[PDB]
Structure formats: C-alpha cells, structure tokens
Amino acid sequence: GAPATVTEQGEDITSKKDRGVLKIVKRVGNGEETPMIGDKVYVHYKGKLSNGKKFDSSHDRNEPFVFSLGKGQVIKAWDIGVATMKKGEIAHLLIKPEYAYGSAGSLPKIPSNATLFFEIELLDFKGE
Numbered sequence: 001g002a003p004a005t006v007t008e009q010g011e012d013i014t015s016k017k018d019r020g021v022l023k024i025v026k027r028v029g030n031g032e033e034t035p036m037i038g039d040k041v042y043v044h045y046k047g048k049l050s051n052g053k054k055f056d057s058s059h060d061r062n063e064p065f066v067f068s069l070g071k072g073q074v075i076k077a078w079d080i081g082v083a084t085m086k087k088g089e090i091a092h093l094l095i096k097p098e099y100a101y102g103s104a105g106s107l108p109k110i111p112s113n114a115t116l117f118f119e120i121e122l123l124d125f126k127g128e
C-alpha cells in the first residue's frame with residue numbers, strides 16, 4: 001500500500017528531522033522551480049485518516065483548491081510539503097499529528113492524535 005511505501009522509503013522533509021512529514025514523489029514535475037512563501041498554489045488532492053474511515057477529495061469541489069503558501073492557510077505539513085513540489089508533481093505525504101491537528105484534533109471529524117495521508121498534485125503556482 002501507498003502509506004507503507006512512504007513509511008519505509010519516504011524522505012523526512014521536516015526541519016527537525018522527526019519523521020513528522022514523510023514524502024514520496026509519485027510523478028516527477030516539470031522544470032526546476034518550487035514555490036516560495038507567499039506564492040498562490042493550485043492543487044488537486046485526496047486525503048484520509050490513516051486510522052478509521054474518513055476520506056476527502058478535491059474532485060468533489062466545483063472550483064480549484066487554492067491557498068497562499070506559508071501563510072498558515074492549511075496545516076503545517078502542507079506548508080512544508082507543497083513547498084518541496086514542482087509544477088506537475090504528484091506526491092504522497094504521511095503526516096504525524098504534530099504537523100496536522102495534534103492532540104486537540106478537529107472534533108468530531110478529525111480525532112485526537114490522528115496521522116493523515118495525502119496524495120497531492122501541484123497544478124500551478126504564481127506570485128501574489
């Protein structure tokens with residue numbers, strides 16, 4: 001399974017090297033550039049709780065999923081992880097609770113101390 005590959009082969013992209021965010025590149029992107037803080041990023045994604053049964057996909061939206069990188073618009077793991085991606089890249093991220101919703105959770109949807117998994121495709125990024 002995809003999560004297991006991340007655990008065994010994924011790169012630790014955390015500053016502290018605590019395995020809180022682990023990454024695998026599933027499809028290589030184009031060019032060289034990865035987005036800076038403040039850039040607007042456009043993604044498709046799907047995500048799940050690693051334990052139990054809750055799944056979320058951007059393909060259910062009627063508009064693109066967009067956020068400004070490094071501005072605290074998403075969980076910490078996404079500001080860390082998307083920053084490492086190239087345009088066109090698809091990545092898997094396995095995320096410990098400290099880089100997501102922590103001991104608090106986001107109840108009832110996200111439990112306390114939830115590990116998360118995401119597949120993310122970086123569609124584009126632009127300066128704001």
Ligand SMILES: COc1ccc(CC[C@@H](OC(=O)[C@@H]2CCCCN2C(=O)[C@H](c2cc(OC)c(OC)c(OC)c2)C2CCCCC2)c2cccc(OCC(=O)O)c2)cc1OC
Pocket residue numbers: 045047048049054055056066067072073074075076078100101106109110116
């Ligand atoms: C800086 O810290 C935070 C920032 C933002 C939040 C809110 C949840 C925040 O969710 C997230 O950051 C992560 C990563 C981005 C995709 C969504 N996501 C989630 O955890 C997902 C999520 C979480 C949600 O709420 C917790 C959602 O809102 C109801 C949501 O709606 C589509 C999706 C989880 C869903 C269950 C299965 C596991 C994934 C969020 C959700 C929807 C859109 C977002 O930004 C774009 C916009 O607003 O259009 C941001 C929590 C934060 O801390 C807990």
